[PDB]
Structure formats: structure tokens, C-alpha cells
Amino acid sequence: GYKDNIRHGVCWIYYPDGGSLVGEVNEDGEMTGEKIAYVYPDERTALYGKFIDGEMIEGKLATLMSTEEGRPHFELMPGNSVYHFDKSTSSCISTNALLPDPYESERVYVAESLISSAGEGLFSKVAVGPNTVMSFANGVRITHQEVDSRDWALNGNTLSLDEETVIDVPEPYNHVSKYCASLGHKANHSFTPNCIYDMFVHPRFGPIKCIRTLRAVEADEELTVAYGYDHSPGPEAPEWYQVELKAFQATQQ
């Protein structure tokens, strides 16, 4: 049946975040087969294998080595690292809490923050340019009502996803020894940040957010983001943030 026509070609479908699905689609235009891949935004790191309508059933870590006539040419990495679609629930953060994301692992690490009295922070492993996705913010999915109706002490890393859902990394998963599948919850706040939270559609985590650089960042530079609490609902925010906001407003004046 092989012929030079669309039915025998390959398709790439991009998310606005720059990740993509690639492969030969079936008769209904679906990303279904044994040789489908998700390609991360570096256009190099890939999860290649069995997908059904774009959902990763068994993706093996690979490197996109070249494209020929639009067709991706992958090399599988050693180790038998496999991944699957595993969107969190209200009560389960991951079925592999200790299995790191391979793209994130090459780009960030956790260490003591340079910000005083601020615990751990997130650092770049290597020099990167502007607009680079560095890290993923995954967590359990709970309601705004639950979050808004409980103490700030429990809301240290709650991250709004949309009007219906908040992502949380509750104790003890805020410790790397118990959860390290994603690390975006380790980035500290700055009113002068070098990164932003941005939407991301992840093949393992599903629809989440990521940390993306605004500008070039050096190796070993701390990654910071604006937490974006409501300043005028004074602010509804932790005391440390309220103090820093006053200091920030003072510098602007």
C-alpha cells in the first residue's frame, strides 16, 4: 500500500508550549500506534512508543537524532526508562513519585536558596536562552474552596491551574526524598523574577504548568518566579511575601 501520499506520511502536532506529538496517524487522524512519540520543547528529548489517541501508554526515553523528509529518527537511551500517562488525582500525586522527569533532570537541580530564610530553591544546571522550559509544576488536584478555606500554613506551594483546580504538593511530598518526579514547586518567589509560570501539556503529568525563562540564565543561577498573590482582594498572602512586597514597592520609589 506504500505510496507517496498523505496517508503514508508523518504528522507533527504541536502544543502552544512547544512540545509535540509525532508519528503516522491512523485513518481517523489519531496519534495511535507503536511508534508514536512525544517530543519535548528542546526538539531533542523524546518519549517514544505506544500511544492511543495521543495518550502515552508506554513511552521509552529517546533522543531525536535527525529528521529525514519530516520523519523523526530516534535513538533509544539505555536503562529501560519507560513512562506512562499518569495525571494526578485529588489524592495521588504520581504512581512513580521518585522517578524524575528526564528533560527536567538535565536542566535543574535543588539546593539551598540564596534568598535568606527561604529553604531550598531551584537552580539551572546549564546555561540556557530566553523562553526555555526548565521545570514542571505537578501536584495533586484540589479545589479553590478547599485551599481558600484552610490555613496559609497548608498553602505554601498551592498553584492555581485554572478557575476550577489548584495544584498542591502537600507534606511530605514537598521533600525531594519523597517526591522528585517534578521540581517546579521548588522555585522561590521574586518580585524581579527570571522565569514565569506558563501552561504546559505534559505526556505523563497531563495539563499542568511549567517554569519558563524570561531571559538567558547562567549555569548555577537560581530560578525565581512571581507567585502572583492578590495584592488587593491588604494582600492575601504569607507574611514573608507581604514584607517583600513593601520592600519591592519601596525600591520602585
Binding site: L159, S160, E163
Partner: peptide, 8 residues
């Protein structure tokens, strides 16, 4: 809201 990055 007691969470980061909500659109207000």
C-alpha cells in the same frame, strides 16, 4: 485566593 498565579 490562597494559591499562586491565579488570573484575577
Amino acid at each position: 485566593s490562597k494559591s499562586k498565579d491565579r488570573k484575577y
